[PDB]
């Protein structure tokens, strides 16, 4: 029989031990240790120089936690007690108790410099200011996860009688605006793999029936999530809700398989923390405990790469066997052009709506454009070698720099395709007319 749970992102179960992590992210991590019927909570940072690490005794059993650059929020799901602790001492630590119905429990909490949110098993949404003053109350499908950035908030909802779904909204000073509300989520539930209920796995899924390791906004403010498919998913076109679509941008199983030399090693797992441009920030976990353990390892990094390869063909092309596979130029150029295109489009959306957030992204986009045309030229040259005039000409239309088109003319001449040379220069004339206009 199914059962609802309280949850916090990137924390861990106890296993059999007396300690666990409550939440973890690129700014820091929260850990706790059991001291008889009392608990010690510690807030740690990946910049302890800026932010004092601090610890205190939890006499309440806080089972919910949220960490940001200003403070840490704690919650007790049964009693409804909550507590906020700023990292500084300019702002006070403060506590509050939230009303709860019989059998109702707080399922998730979130806090930003401009908004605070609480959710419950009976689908009630409550919002507050940074002092705990209430703003509003709303009724939804049951809420199972929350995350936020400035006024932007992303929520996940689930019921057997309404399905699995999400909401995207911005709690602006004008009003709460819904981009999407309780729209179906295209993510594989862990219980689809019903037969994998081994003892070590069963503890984790009793701790986290949803299976999701984390959910967060990108460095560019885009929603992202990592599920039981061991794949990182990113929501594209979220700023344009008519056009929104989820993209699988990185599979950890494929990467670890390749990194092992194309081998099925059952021994290493990835714990995600945050996505920064093209690179996932994550912790590498090993062995039966698929959740990270104590002492916490040092963080690692991994690049996003598109799911566009076949294992058997990769092994046959590769044919020191543990060294990562040698990928053909065709496959490499293919994935490069797709990844360049995806990254350029997402960054374009970022800059067109929110501007330069770091002050250099124009350079990144220019570099991506160079990589894109160069990838296409590799694929074009391969097509010319195959003498497929139509496919070669189709690829020519996708280039962006006239310099690449000129290179394509030279390639066509080497390929001895005068018809293709003629048609490419017709395209260059057409683009020159477009450049004149």
């Amino acid at each position: 029989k199914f059962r609802y749970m309280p949850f916090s992102p990137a924390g861990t179960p106890f296993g059999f031990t007396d300690r666990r992590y409550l939440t973890m992210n690129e700014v820091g991590y929260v850990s706790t240790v059991k001291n008889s019927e009392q608990y010690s909570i510690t807030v740690s940072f990946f910049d302890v120089g800026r932010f004092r690490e601090y610890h205190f005794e939890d006499l309440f059993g806080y089972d919910l936690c949220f960490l940001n650059e200003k403070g840490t929020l704690f919650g007790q799901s049964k009693t409804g007690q909550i507590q906020y602790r700023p990292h500084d001492s300019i702002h006070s630590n403060w506590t509050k108790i939230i009303p709860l119905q019989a059998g109702e429990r707080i399922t998730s909490v979130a806090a930003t410099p401009v908004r605070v949110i609480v959710g419950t098993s009976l689908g009630y949404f409550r919002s507050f200011n940074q002092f705990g003053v209430p703003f509003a109350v709303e009724k939804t499908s049951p809420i199972v996860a929350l995350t936020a950035q400035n006024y932007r908030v992303f929520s996940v909802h689930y019921s057997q009688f309404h399905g699995l779904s999400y909401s995207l909204s911005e709690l602006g000073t004008s009003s709460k605006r819904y981009y999407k509300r309780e729209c179906p989520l295209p993510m594989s539930l862990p219980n689809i793999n019903s037969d994998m209920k081994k003892d070590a796995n069963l503890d984790y899924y009793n701790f986290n029936p949803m299976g999701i390791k984390s959910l967060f906004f990108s460095s560019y403010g885009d929603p992202c999530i990592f599920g039981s498919d061991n794949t990182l998913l990113l929501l594209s076109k979220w700023r344009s809700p008519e056009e929104s679509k989820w993209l699988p941008i990185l599979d950890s199983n494929m990467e670890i398989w390749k990194m092992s030399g194309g081998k099925e090693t059952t021994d290493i797992h990835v714990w995600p923390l945050a996505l920064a441009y093209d690179t996932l920030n994550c912790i590498l976990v090993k062995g039966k405990h698929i959740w990270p353990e104590f002492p916490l390892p040092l963080p690692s990094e991994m690049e996003i790469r598109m799911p566009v390869f076949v294992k058997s063909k990769l092994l046959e092309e590769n044919k020191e066997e543990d060294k990562e596979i040698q990928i053909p130029v065709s496959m490499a150029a293919e994935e490069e052009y797709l990844r360049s295109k995806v990254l350029s489009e997402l960054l374009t959306d970022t800059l067109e709506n929110d501007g330069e957030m770091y002050g250099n992204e124009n350079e990144v986009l220019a570099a991506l454009n160079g990589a894109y045309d160069k990838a296409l030229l590799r694929l074009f040259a391969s097509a010319c070698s195959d003498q497929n005039v139509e496919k070669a000409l189709s690829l020519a239309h996708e280039l962006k720099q006239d310099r690449a088109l000129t290179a394509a003319v030279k390639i066509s001449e080497r390929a001895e395709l005068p018809s293709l040379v003629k048609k490419i220069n017709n395209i260059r004339e057409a683009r020159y007319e477009q450049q004149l206009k």
Partner: peptide
């Protein structure tokens, strides 16, 4: 054909 690519890099 690699020299036209090395062209395309430069």
């Amino acid at each position: 054909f690699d020299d036209i690519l090395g062209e395309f890099e430069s």
